[PDB]
Amino acid sequence: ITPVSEKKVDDKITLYKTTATSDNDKLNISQILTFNFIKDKSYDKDTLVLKAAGNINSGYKKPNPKDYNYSQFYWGGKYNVSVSSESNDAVNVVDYAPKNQNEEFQVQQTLGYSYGGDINISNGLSGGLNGSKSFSETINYKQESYRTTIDRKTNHKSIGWGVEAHKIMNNGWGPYGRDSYDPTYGNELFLGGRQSSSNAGQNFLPTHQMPLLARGNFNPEFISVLSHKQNDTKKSKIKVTYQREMDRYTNQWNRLHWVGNNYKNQNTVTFTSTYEVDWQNHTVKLIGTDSKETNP
Ligand code: NI
């Protein structure tokens, strides 16, 4: 955790910034969190803009190339990120970015704070480079073939996002998804050729033609905005969760042709950090982490 930096921006706004990192290196999940507390003389709530960045590896490993009539590998089917507030009713999640479903290859947005408390989200990064807002923070991430959606359970105490395999192209064919189904060939998502004389373990889409999120890693950038009533003097807790759902893709030779299958979320890998937030001192302390895999 960096020591807090205090910056008087002008006679209305003072900003307090801390950066905190926590990671699990066995799971290859890293959280890089930027906490910006905004003290605005003209607004009677404290505002925290929390940017969640870092890494979630897909967990992909190559299939065994010697597998002859049946093979399989695990891949990054979906990434989940959430931020939740506990232990104080005077704290609420009030805004966040991205705000709407988005399947563009790159997500690039600015979240701006205006004197008096208004939050706006604009498309593109100019909004946080033109410096027109009293405070802004940007998100910038690649998610080619994947789709970001806001979780249905999002409410005043939690925001989460799902970044899910959505429209995957396989050597010009597709698009395919985690669920695609043909009665003859199964899910052809990462199948090499329907008739290939190759080994099962060498009858998959070559790794570099898979999406980066499927075989490599996701680099999340998400913003949560939390408000805290200035009257309240109590600390609060924030839990930040990064998660991958690992799917198992398989192929099998059935007499005349290959069949592909995708099993969803066969291993769920989760990393959570919990911070104590001091609103009076604009400081955060890491009080807990936890890691889980359902099927290592
Ligand atoms: Ni779509």
Q: What is the 3-state secondary structure (H, E, C) of 132-201?
A: CCCEEEEEEEECCCEEEEECCCCECCEEEEEEEECCEEECCEEEECCCCCECCCECCCCECCCCCCCCHH
Distance 103 CA to ligand 1 centre (A): 6
If you count DSSP H runs as helices and E runs as strands, how many of each does the chain have, helices first? 1, 18
Resolution (A): 1.8
Q: Tally Cβ neighbours within 10 Å of residue 92.
A: 17
The technique by which this structure was obtained is X-ray
Amino acid sitting at position 244: R
Q: Which residues, by Cβ under 5 Å, contact ligand 1, an ion?
A: 103
| Nearest CA-CA partner of 32 in 16, 11, 7, 56 | 56
> Is residue 286 within 8 Å of residue 22, measured between CB atoms?
yes
- What CATH architecture applies to the domain 1-296? Distorted Sandwich (2.70)
Compute, in angstroms, the gap from residue 167 CA to the centroid of ligand 1.
Answer: 7
65 CA → ligand 1 middle, Å: 33
The bridge status of strand 257-278 relative to strand 91-97 is unpaired
Q: How far is CA 167 from the centre of its chain?
A: 18
Distance 98 CA to ligand 1 centre (A): 16
Task: Determine the Cα–Cα distance for residues 53 and 179; give it in Å rounded to an integer.
Answer: 29
Q: Compute the radius of gyration of the chain from its Cα atoms.
A: 22
With contact defined as beta carbons under 8 Å apart, do 188 and 180 qualify? Answer: yes
Expressed in angstroms and rounded, the spacing between residue 67 Cα and the centre of ligand 1 is 34
Query: Residue 39 forms beta bridges with which residues?
Result: 14
Q: Are 270 and 241 in contact (CB under 8 A)?
A: yes
Strand pairing of 236-254 and 106-113?
unpaired
Residues 6+ apart with CB under 8 A from 250: 70, 71, 72, 260, 261, 262, 263
Query: Torsions phi, psi of 23, nearest 5?
Result: -150, 160
Q: Residue 186 to residues 89, 156, 181, 207: CA-CA distances in angstroms?
A: 50, 42, 5, 20
Closest CA to 290 of 31, 4, 10, 18: 31
Mention every residue, 6+ apart, whose C-beta is less than 8 A from residue 88: 228, 232, 234, 235, 236, 237
- Distance (Å) from CA 101 to ligand 1 centroid: 9
Evaluated on CA atoms 117, 152, 150, 244, the torsion sign reads: positive
CA distance 139 to 141: 7
